[PDB]
Short mmCIF file of all heavy atoms in Angstrom, two decimals:
data_model
loop_
_atom_site.label_atom_id
_atom_site.label_comp_id
_atom_site.label_asym_id
_atom_site.label_seq_id
_atom_site.Cartn_x
_atom_site.Cartn_y
_atom_site.Cartn_z
N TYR F 45 -29.15 37.19 -11.10
CA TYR F 45 -29.17 36.56 -9.78
C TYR F 45 -28.57 37.54 -8.77
O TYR F 45 -27.99 38.54 -9.16
CB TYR F 45 -28.38 35.21 -9.80
CG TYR F 45 -26.90 35.39 -9.98
CD1 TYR F 45 -26.06 35.25 -8.93
CD2 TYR F 45 -26.39 35.67 -11.23
CE1 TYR F 45 -24.76 35.43 -9.05
CE2 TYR F 45 -25.05 35.82 -11.35
CZ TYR F 45 -24.23 35.70 -10.28
OH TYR F 45 -22.90 35.84 -10.43
N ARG F 59 2.03 43.44 -8.26
CA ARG F 59 1.49 42.25 -8.91
C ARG F 59 0.03 42.38 -9.32
O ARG F 59 -0.53 41.43 -9.81
CB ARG F 59 1.58 41.01 -8.03
CG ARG F 59 2.99 40.67 -7.48
CD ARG F 59 3.96 40.56 -8.58
NE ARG F 59 4.01 39.30 -9.30
CZ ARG F 59 4.99 38.42 -9.21
NH1 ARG F 59 6.03 38.66 -8.46
NH2 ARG F 59 4.94 37.31 -9.93
N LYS F 62 -3.44 45.84 -14.63
CA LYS F 62 -4.27 47.00 -14.92
C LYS F 62 -5.76 46.63 -14.86
O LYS F 62 -6.52 47.41 -14.31
CB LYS F 62 -3.90 47.61 -16.27
CG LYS F 62 -2.56 48.26 -16.29
CD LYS F 62 -2.69 49.60 -15.70
CE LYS F 62 -3.50 50.49 -16.60
NZ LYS F 62 -2.83 50.63 -17.86
N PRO F 63 -6.21 45.56 -15.52
CA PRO F 63 -7.63 45.21 -15.38
C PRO F 63 -8.07 44.89 -13.98
O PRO F 63 -9.21 45.15 -13.62
CB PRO F 63 -7.78 44.00 -16.29
CG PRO F 63 -6.34 43.46 -16.59
CD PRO F 63 -5.59 44.59 -16.66
N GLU F 81 -17.41 34.87 -4.36
CA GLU F 81 -18.81 35.27 -4.52
C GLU F 81 -19.67 34.38 -3.62
O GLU F 81 -19.48 33.20 -3.51
CB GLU F 81 -19.26 35.10 -5.91
CG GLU F 81 -19.20 36.37 -6.68
CD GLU F 81 -20.02 36.24 -7.92
OE1 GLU F 81 -21.00 35.53 -7.86
OE2 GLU F 81 -19.67 36.89 -8.92
N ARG F 83 -23.92 33.71 -2.74
CA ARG F 83 -25.28 33.92 -3.21
C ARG F 83 -26.15 34.47 -2.09
O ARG F 83 -26.22 33.89 -1.03
CB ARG F 83 -25.89 32.63 -3.78
CG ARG F 83 -25.17 32.12 -5.00
CD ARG F 83 -25.61 32.89 -6.21
NE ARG F 83 -26.90 32.53 -6.69
CZ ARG F 83 -27.16 31.56 -7.54
NH1 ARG F 83 -26.14 30.88 -8.06
NH2 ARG F 83 -28.37 31.26 -7.90
N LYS F 114 -5.29 18.47 0.47
CA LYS F 114 -3.90 18.24 0.25
C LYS F 114 -3.66 17.36 -0.96
O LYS F 114 -4.30 16.35 -1.14
CB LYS F 114 -3.24 17.57 1.45
CG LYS F 114 -3.10 18.44 2.61
CD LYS F 114 -2.19 17.78 3.58
CE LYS F 114 -1.70 18.77 4.55
NZ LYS F 114 -0.37 18.42 4.94
N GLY F 115 -2.67 17.74 -1.76
CA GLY F 115 -2.37 17.10 -3.01
C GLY F 115 -1.51 15.89 -2.82
O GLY F 115 -0.42 15.99 -2.25
N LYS F 123 -4.39 3.05 -2.41
CA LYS F 123 -4.52 4.30 -1.68
C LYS F 123 -5.78 5.04 -2.06
O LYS F 123 -6.50 5.53 -1.21
CB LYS F 123 -3.30 5.14 -1.91
CG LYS F 123 -3.26 6.45 -1.16
CD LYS F 123 -1.95 7.09 -1.39
CE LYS F 123 -1.90 8.41 -0.74
NZ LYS F 123 -1.98 8.32 0.71
N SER F 137 3.04 -13.62 -8.52
CA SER F 137 4.01 -13.20 -9.52
C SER F 137 3.79 -11.75 -9.96
O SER F 137 3.00 -11.48 -10.82
CB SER F 137 3.93 -14.08 -10.74
OG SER F 137 4.66 -15.25 -10.54
N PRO F 143 -4.42 -3.78 -9.71
CA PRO F 143 -5.90 -3.75 -9.53
C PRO F 143 -6.61 -5.08 -9.64
O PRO F 143 -7.60 -5.26 -8.93
CB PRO F 143 -6.34 -2.79 -10.62
CG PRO F 143 -5.18 -2.77 -11.65
CD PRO F 143 -4.07 -2.78 -10.89
N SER F 145 -8.84 -7.68 -11.96
CA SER F 145 -9.62 -7.72 -13.17
C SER F 145 -10.33 -6.36 -13.39
O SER F 145 -10.61 -5.64 -12.46
CB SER F 145 -10.64 -8.82 -13.13
OG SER F 145 -11.29 -8.99 -14.34
N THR F 151 -18.94 -10.24 -23.65
CA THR F 151 -20.03 -9.37 -23.28
C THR F 151 -19.63 -8.68 -22.04
O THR F 151 -19.46 -9.31 -21.00
CB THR F 151 -21.33 -10.18 -23.03
OG1 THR F 151 -21.81 -10.66 -24.29
CG2 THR F 151 -22.37 -9.34 -22.37
N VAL F 155 -14.61 -1.66 -21.18
CA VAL F 155 -14.54 -1.23 -19.79
C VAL F 155 -15.62 -0.18 -19.58
O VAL F 155 -15.86 0.68 -20.41
CB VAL F 155 -13.14 -0.70 -19.47
CG1 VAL F 155 -13.06 -0.24 -18.06
CG2 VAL F 155 -12.14 -1.76 -19.74
N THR F 171 -15.68 19.94 0.89
CA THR F 171 -16.50 20.60 1.93
C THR F 171 -16.76 19.65 3.05
O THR F 171 -17.06 18.49 2.80
CB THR F 171 -17.86 21.04 1.34
OG1 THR F 171 -17.64 21.98 0.27
CG2 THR F 171 -18.67 21.77 2.40
N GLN F 173 -19.10 19.24 6.60
CA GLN F 173 -20.43 19.76 6.95
C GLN F 173 -20.67 19.63 8.48
O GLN F 173 -20.28 18.69 9.10
CB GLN F 173 -21.50 18.99 6.23
CG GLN F 173 -21.44 19.21 4.74
CD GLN F 173 -22.79 19.09 4.10
OE1 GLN F 173 -23.43 20.08 3.78
NE2 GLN F 173 -23.23 17.84 3.94
N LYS F 208 -27.67 22.20 6.21
CA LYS F 208 -28.43 21.13 6.77
C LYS F 208 -28.77 21.46 8.24
O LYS F 208 -28.69 22.61 8.68
CB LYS F 208 -27.67 19.80 6.74
CG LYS F 208 -27.65 19.17 5.38
CD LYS F 208 -26.99 17.84 5.55
CE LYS F 208 -27.03 17.13 4.29
NZ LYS F 208 -26.75 15.70 4.55
P U G 10 -9.93 -11.17 -2.25
OP1 U G 10 -9.59 -10.40 -1.12
OP2 U G 10 -11.34 -11.67 -2.35
"O5'" U G 10 -9.59 -10.35 -3.55
"C5'" U G 10 -8.42 -9.55 -3.64
"C4'" U G 10 -8.28 -8.91 -4.99
"O4'" U G 10 -8.14 -9.91 -6.03
"C3'" U G 10 -9.45 -8.06 -5.48
"O3'" U G 10 -9.49 -6.77 -4.89
"C2'" U G 10 -9.17 -8.00 -6.97
"O2'" U G 10 -8.05 -7.17 -7.17
"C1'" U G 10 -8.69 -9.42 -7.22
N1 U G 10 -9.82 -10.35 -7.64
C2 U G 10 -10.13 -10.44 -8.97
O2 U G 10 -9.62 -9.76 -9.82
N3 U G 10 -11.13 -11.30 -9.32
C4 U G 10 -11.83 -12.10 -8.45
O4 U G 10 -12.70 -12.81 -8.90
C5 U G 10 -11.44 -11.95 -7.11
C6 U G 10 -10.46 -11.14 -6.78
P U G 70 -24.37 -16.45 -18.80
OP1 U G 70 -24.25 -17.12 -20.05
OP2 U G 70 -24.02 -17.11 -17.57
"O5'" U G 70 -23.48 -15.13 -18.87
"C5'" U G 70 -23.64 -14.21 -19.93
"C4'" U G 70 -22.93 -12.89 -19.61
"O4'" U G 70 -23.38 -12.44 -18.30
"C3'" U G 70 -21.42 -12.96 -19.45
"O3'" U G 70 -20.76 -12.96 -20.68
"C2'" U G 70 -21.12 -11.75 -18.56
"O2'" U G 70 -21.13 -10.59 -19.35
"C1'" U G 70 -22.35 -11.71 -17.67
N1 U G 70 -22.14 -12.30 -16.34
C2 U G 70 -21.53 -11.54 -15.41
O2 U G 70 -21.16 -10.40 -15.66
N3 U G 70 -21.37 -12.06 -14.18
C4 U G 70 -21.76 -13.30 -13.81
O4 U G 70 -21.56 -13.68 -12.66
C5 U G 70 -22.37 -14.06 -14.82
C6 U G 70 -22.56 -13.54 -16.03
P C G 74 -15.05 -15.98 -17.77
OP1 C G 74 -14.54 -16.26 -19.12
OP2 C G 74 -15.38 -17.06 -16.82
"O5'" C G 74 -13.97 -14.99 -17.17
"C5'" C G 74 -13.36 -14.00 -17.92
"C4'" C G 74 -12.67 -12.97 -17.09
"O4'" C G 74 -13.54 -12.58 -16.00
"C3'" C G 74 -11.40 -13.43 -16.39
"O3'" C G 74 -10.26 -13.37 -17.21
"C2'" C G 74 -11.34 -12.47 -15.23
"O2'" C G 74 -10.79 -11.26 -15.68
"C1'" C G 74 -12.77 -12.23 -14.87
N1 C G 74 -13.26 -13.02 -13.71
C2 C G 74 -12.93 -12.57 -12.46
O2 C G 74 -12.26 -11.57 -12.38
N3 C G 74 -13.34 -13.17 -11.35
C4 C G 74 -14.10 -14.28 -11.50
N4 C G 74 -14.48 -14.89 -10.42
C5 C G 74 -14.47 -14.76 -12.75
C6 C G 74 -14.05 -14.11 -13.85
N1 U G 79 -4.01 -18.05 -11.97
C2 U G 79 -5.22 -18.87 -11.89
N3 U G 79 -5.47 -19.67 -10.71
C4 U G 79 -4.57 -19.69 -9.61
C5 U G 79 -3.37 -18.91 -9.69
C6 U G 79 -3.13 -18.05 -10.86
O2 U G 79 -6.00 -18.88 -12.79
O4 U G 79 -4.80 -20.37 -8.67
"C1'" U G 79 -2.36 -18.85 -8.53
"C2'" U G 79 -1.62 -20.08 -8.09
"O2'" U G 79 -1.82 -20.20 -6.70
"C3'" U G 79 -0.20 -19.77 -8.39
"C4'" U G 79 -0.12 -18.29 -8.34
"O3'" U G 79 0.72 -20.38 -7.50
"O4'" U G 79 -1.40 -17.89 -8.89
"C5'" U G 79 0.92 -17.63 -9.21
"O5'" U G 79 0.44 -17.48 -10.51
P U G 79 1.04 -16.42 -11.53
OP1 U G 79 2.52 -16.59 -11.53
OP2 U G 79 0.29 -16.52 -12.79
P A G 134 -11.24 33.94 -10.80
OP1 A G 134 -10.51 33.28 -9.69
OP2 A G 134 -11.33 33.25 -12.05
"O5'" A G 134 -12.67 34.29 -10.24
"C5'" A G 134 -12.87 35.37 -9.36
"C4'" A G 134 -14.27 35.90 -9.46
"O4'" A G 134 -14.44 36.73 -10.63
"C3'" A G 134 -15.37 34.84 -9.57
"O3'" A G 134 -15.70 34.24 -8.35
"C2'" A G 134 -16.50 35.63 -10.20
"O2'" A G 134 -17.09 36.46 -9.23
"C1'" A G 134 -15.71 36.51 -11.16
N9 A G 134 -15.56 35.91 -12.48
C8 A G 134 -14.45 35.26 -12.89
N7 A G 134 -14.63 34.88 -14.17
C5 A G 134 -15.85 35.31 -14.59
C6 A G 134 -16.53 35.16 -15.78
N6 A G 134 -16.20 34.61 -16.94
N1 A G 134 -17.74 35.69 -15.93
C2 A G 134 -18.35 36.34 -14.90
N3 A G 134 -17.67 36.46 -13.72
C4 A G 134 -16.42 35.92 -13.54
P C G 135 -16.54 32.89 -8.35
OP1 C G 135 -16.72 32.47 -6.96
OP2 C G 135 -15.94 32.04 -9.36
"O5'" C G 135 -17.94 33.37 -8.90
"C5'" C G 135 -18.90 32.45 -9.41
"C4'" C G 135 -19.88 33.18 -10.27
"O4'" C G 135 -19.18 33.72 -11.43
"C3'" C G 135 -21.01 32.37 -10.87
"O3'" C G 135 -22.08 32.22 -10.02
"C2'" C G 135 -21.34 33.11 -12.13
"O2'" C G 135 -22.22 34.18 -11.81
"C1'" C G 135 -20.04 33.74 -12.54
N1 C G 135 -19.34 33.05 -13.63
C2 C G 135 -19.91 32.99 -14.90
O2 C G 135 -21.03 33.44 -15.12
N3 C G 135 -19.22 32.38 -15.87
C4 C G 135 -18.04 31.89 -15.64
N4 C G 135 -17.45 31.29 -16.66
C5 C G 135 -17.43 31.94 -14.34
C6 C G 135 -18.12 32.54 -13.38
P U G 136 -22.84 30.83 -9.77
OP1 U G 136 -23.56 30.90 -8.53
OP2 U G 136 -21.87 29.77 -10.04
"O5'" U G 136 -23.90 30.82 -10.96
"C5'" U G 136 -24.89 31.83 -11.08
"C4'" U G 136 -25.53 31.70 -12.42
"O4'" U G 136 -24.53 31.92 -13.42
"C3'" U G 136 -26.10 30.35 -12.75
"O3'" U G 136 -27.43 30.22 -12.28
"C2'" U G 136 -26.03 30.25 -14.25
"O2'" U G 136 -27.16 30.89 -14.84
"C1'" U G 136 -24.80 31.14 -14.56
N1 U G 136 -23.58 30.44 -14.96
C2 U G 136 -23.47 29.98 -16.22
O2 U G 136 -24.39 29.97 -17.03
N3 U G 136 -22.26 29.47 -16.57
C4 U G 136 -21.15 29.40 -15.76
O4 U G 136 -20.14 28.96 -16.21
C5 U G 136 -21.31 29.97 -14.49
C6 U G 136 -22.51 30.46 -14.16
P C G 222 2.03 15.72 5.33
OP1 C G 222 1.36 16.35 4.20
OP2 C G 222 1.66 15.90 6.72
"O5'" C G 222 1.91 14.17 5.03
"C5'" C G 222 2.09 13.63 3.75
"C4'" C G 222 2.50 12.20 3.86
"O4'" C G 222 3.58 12.07 4.82
"C3'" C G 222 1.44 11.26 4.36
"O3'" C G 222 0.49 10.90 3.41
"C2'" C G 222 2.28 10.11 4.90
"O2'" C G 222 2.74 9.33 3.81
"C1'" C G 222 3.45 10.85 5.49
N1 C G 222 3.36 11.07 6.95
C2 C G 222 3.48 10.03 7.81
O2 C G 222 3.62 8.89 7.40
N3 C G 222 3.43 10.23 9.13
C4 C G 222 3.28 11.40 9.57
N4 C G 222 3.25 11.59 10.87
C5 C G 222 3.14 12.52 8.73
C6 C G 222 3.21 12.31 7.45
P U G 223 -0.98 10.49 3.85
OP1 U G 223 -1.51 9.74 2.74
OP2 U G 223 -1.64 11.63 4.45
"O5'" U G 223 -0.80 9.45 5.01
"C5'" U G 223 -1.03 8.07 4.82
"C4'" U G 223 -0.68 7.26 6.02
"O4'" U G 223 0.27 7.98 6.82
"C3'" U G 223 -1.83 6.97 6.97
"O3'" U G 223 -2.49 5.80 6.58
"C2'" U G 223 -1.11 6.81 8.30
"O2'" U G 223 -0.60 5.45 8.44
"C1'" U G 223 0.09 7.71 8.15
N1 U G 223 -0.01 8.98 8.90
C2 U G 223 0.15 8.94 10.26
O2 U G 223 0.27 7.94 10.87
N3 U G 223 0.08 10.13 10.85
C4 U G 223 -0.06 11.33 10.23
O4 U G 223 -0.08 12.31 10.94
C5 U G 223 -0.18 11.30 8.85
C6 U G 223 -0.17 10.15 8.22
P C G 229 -18.43 15.53 15.16
OP1 C G 229 -19.29 16.38 15.95
OP2 C G 229 -18.31 14.10 15.56
"O5'" C G 229 -18.98 15.55 13.66
"C5'" C G 229 -19.00 16.76 12.90
"C4'" C G 229 -18.96 16.51 11.42
"O4'" C G 229 -17.72 15.85 11.08
"C3'" C G 229 -19.99 15.61 10.85
"O3'" C G 229 -21.25 16.22 10.67
"C2'" C G 229 -19.39 15.17 9.54
"O2'" C G 229 -19.44 16.21 8.62
"C1'" C G 229 -17.91 15.02 9.98
N1 C G 229 -17.61 13.62 10.31
C2 C G 229 -17.43 12.72 9.28
O2 C G 229 -17.55 13.13 8.13
N3 C G 229 -17.14 11.44 9.53
C4 C G 229 -17.04 11.05 10.77
N4 C G 229 -16.78 9.76 10.92
C5 C G 229 -17.22 11.90 11.87
C6 C G 229 -17.51 13.18 11.60
P G G 231 -26.42 13.46 7.19
OP1 G G 231 -27.18 14.70 7.12
OP2 G G 231 -26.24 12.79 8.47
"O5'" G G 231 -27.08 12.47 6.18
"C5'" G G 231 -26.76 12.56 4.79
"C4'" G G 231 -26.87 11.25 4.12
"O4'" G G 231 -25.70 10.45 4.49
"C3'" G G 231 -28.08 10.45 4.48
"O3'" G G 231 -28.58 9.71 3.38
"C2'" G G 231 -27.54 9.46 5.54
"O2'" G G 231 -28.27 8.28 5.66
"C1'" G G 231 -26.13 9.24 5.05
N9 G G 231 -25.27 8.83 6.12
C8 G G 231 -25.16 9.45 7.32
N7 G G 231 -24.40 8.85 8.19
C5 G G 231 -23.98 7.76 7.49
C6 G G 231 -23.14 6.72 7.91
O6 G G 231 -22.56 6.56 8.97
N1 G G 231 -22.95 5.77 6.92
C2 G G 231 -23.51 5.82 5.69
N2 G G 231 -23.21 4.82 4.88
N3 G G 231 -24.32 6.77 5.30
C4 G G 231 -24.49 7.70 6.26
P C G 272 -19.03 21.21 -3.14
OP1 C G 272 -18.09 22.08 -2.47
OP2 C G 272 -20.30 21.78 -3.63
"O5'" C G 272 -18.31 20.55 -4.34
"C5'" C G 272 -17.12 19.83 -4.18
"C4'" C G 272 -16.87 18.87 -5.36
"O4'" C G 272 -17.94 17.93 -5.45
"C3'" C G 272 -16.84 19.53 -6.74
"O3'" C G 272 -15.62 20.13 -7.05
"C2'" C G 272 -17.15 18.35 -7.63
"O2'" C G 272 -16.00 17.51 -7.75
"C1'" C G 272 -18.16 17.58 -6.78
N1 C G 272 -19.57 17.85 -7.18
C2 C G 272 -20.05 17.37 -8.37
O2 C G 272 -19.28 16.81 -9.14
N3 C G 272 -21.29 17.59 -8.74
C4 C G 272 -22.12 18.24 -7.94
N4 C G 272 -23.36 18.39 -8.33
C5 C G 272 -21.67 18.71 -6.69
C6 C G 272 -20.42 18.49 -6.34
P U G 285 -17.05 48.53 -15.70
OP1 U G 285 -17.41 49.88 -15.23
OP2 U G 285 -17.49 48.15 -17.06
"O5'" U G 285 -15.48 48.39 -15.67
"C5'" U G 285 -14.77 48.43 -14.43
"C4'" U G 285 -13.39 47.83 -14.56
"O4'" U G 285 -13.48 46.42 -14.81
"C3'" U G 285 -12.55 48.38 -15.70
"O3'" U G 285 -11.95 49.59 -15.38
"C2'" U G 285 -11.57 47.25 -15.91
"O2'" U G 285 -10.57 47.32 -14.94
"C1'" U G 285 -12.42 46.02 -15.63
N1 U G 285 -12.93 45.38 -16.84
C2 U G 285 -12.12 44.69 -17.63
O2 U G 285 -10.91 44.53 -17.41
N3 U G 285 -12.64 44.17 -18.78
C4 U G 285 -13.93 44.27 -19.15
O4 U G 285 -14.30 43.76 -20.21
C5 U G 285 -14.76 45.02 -18.28
C6 U G 285 -14.24 45.53 -17.18
P G G 310 -1.01 44.94 -17.67
OP1 G G 310 -1.44 44.83 -16.29
OP2 G G 310 0.29 45.55 -17.96
"O5'" G G 310 -0.96 43.47 -18.31
"C5'" G G 310 -1.99 42.55 -18.11
"C4'" G G 310 -2.13 41.62 -19.29
"O4'" G G 310 -1.79 42.35 -20.51
"C3'" G G 310 -1.20 40.42 -19.34
"O3'" G G 310 -1.62 39.38 -18.49
"C2'" G G 310 -1.22 40.06 -20.82
"O2'" G G 310 -2.46 39.49 -21.16
"C1'" G G 310 -1.20 41.46 -21.44
N9 G G 310 0.17 41.89 -21.74
C8 G G 310 0.88 42.90 -21.14
N7 G G 310 2.03 43.07 -21.63
C5 G G 310 2.11 42.15 -22.67
C6 G G 310 3.14 41.85 -23.56
O6 G G 310 4.27 42.38 -23.67
N1 G G 310 2.79 40.82 -24.41
C2 G G 310 1.61 40.17 -24.40
N2 G G 310 1.50 39.23 -25.30
N3 G G 310 0.66 40.42 -23.57
C4 G G 310 0.96 41.39 -22.73
P A G 320 0.30 19.78 -1.78
OP1 A G 320 -1.09 19.74 -1.41
OP2 A G 320 0.86 18.56 -2.31
"O5'" A G 320 0.31 20.93 -2.86
"C5'" A G 320 -0.75 21.01 -3.78
"C4'" A G 320 -0.32 21.17 -5.21
"O4'" A G 320 0.68 22.24 -5.26
"C3'" A G 320 0.36 20.02 -5.87
"O3'" A G 320 -0.50 19.01 -6.32
"C2'" A G 320 1.14 20.70 -6.99
"O2'" A G 320 0.27 21.09 -8.05
"C1'" A G 320 1.60 21.95 -6.32
N9 A G 320 2.90 21.77 -5.67
C8 A G 320 3.13 21.81 -4.38
N7 A G 320 4.43 21.59 -4.19
C5 A G 320 5.02 21.42 -5.42
C6 A G 320 6.30 21.20 -5.78
N6 A G 320 7.40 21.05 -5.00
N1 A G 320 6.65 21.04 -7.03
C2 A G 320 5.70 21.14 -8.00
N3 A G 320 4.43 21.41 -7.65
C4 A G 320 4.08 21.54 -6.33
P G G 330 8.28 40.20 -6.10
OP1 G G 330 8.38 41.49 -5.46
OP2 G G 330 7.25 39.99 -7.10
"O5'" G G 330 9.66 39.90 -6.83
"C5'" G G 330 10.90 40.25 -6.26
"C4'" G G 330 12.04 39.86 -7.16
"O4'" G G 330 11.80 38.54 -7.66
"C3'" G G 330 12.21 40.69 -8.41
"O3'" G G 330 12.92 41.88 -8.08
"C2'" G G 330 12.98 39.72 -9.30
"O2'" G G 330 14.35 39.70 -8.95
"C1'" G G 330 12.41 38.39 -8.89
N9 G G 330 11.43 37.81 -9.84
C8 G G 330 10.09 37.76 -9.64
N7 G G 330 9.46 37.19 -10.59
C5 G G 330 10.42 36.82 -11.49
C6 G G 330 10.32 36.18 -12.71
O6 G G 330 9.33 35.79 -13.29
N1 G G 330 11.53 36.01 -13.32
C2 G G 330 12.73 36.40 -12.77
N2 G G 330 13.79 36.14 -13.50
N3 G G 330 12.84 37.00 -11.65
C4 G G 330 11.64 37.20 -11.05
#
Side-chain angles (χ1 to χ4, degrees):
Chain F
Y45 68 103
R59 305 307 277 250
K62 291 279 293 296
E81 264 196 29
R83 296 282 284 271
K114 287 195 164 212
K123 183 175 177 63
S137 278
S145 189
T151 288
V155 180
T171 300
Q173 296 208 101
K208 282 187 176 196

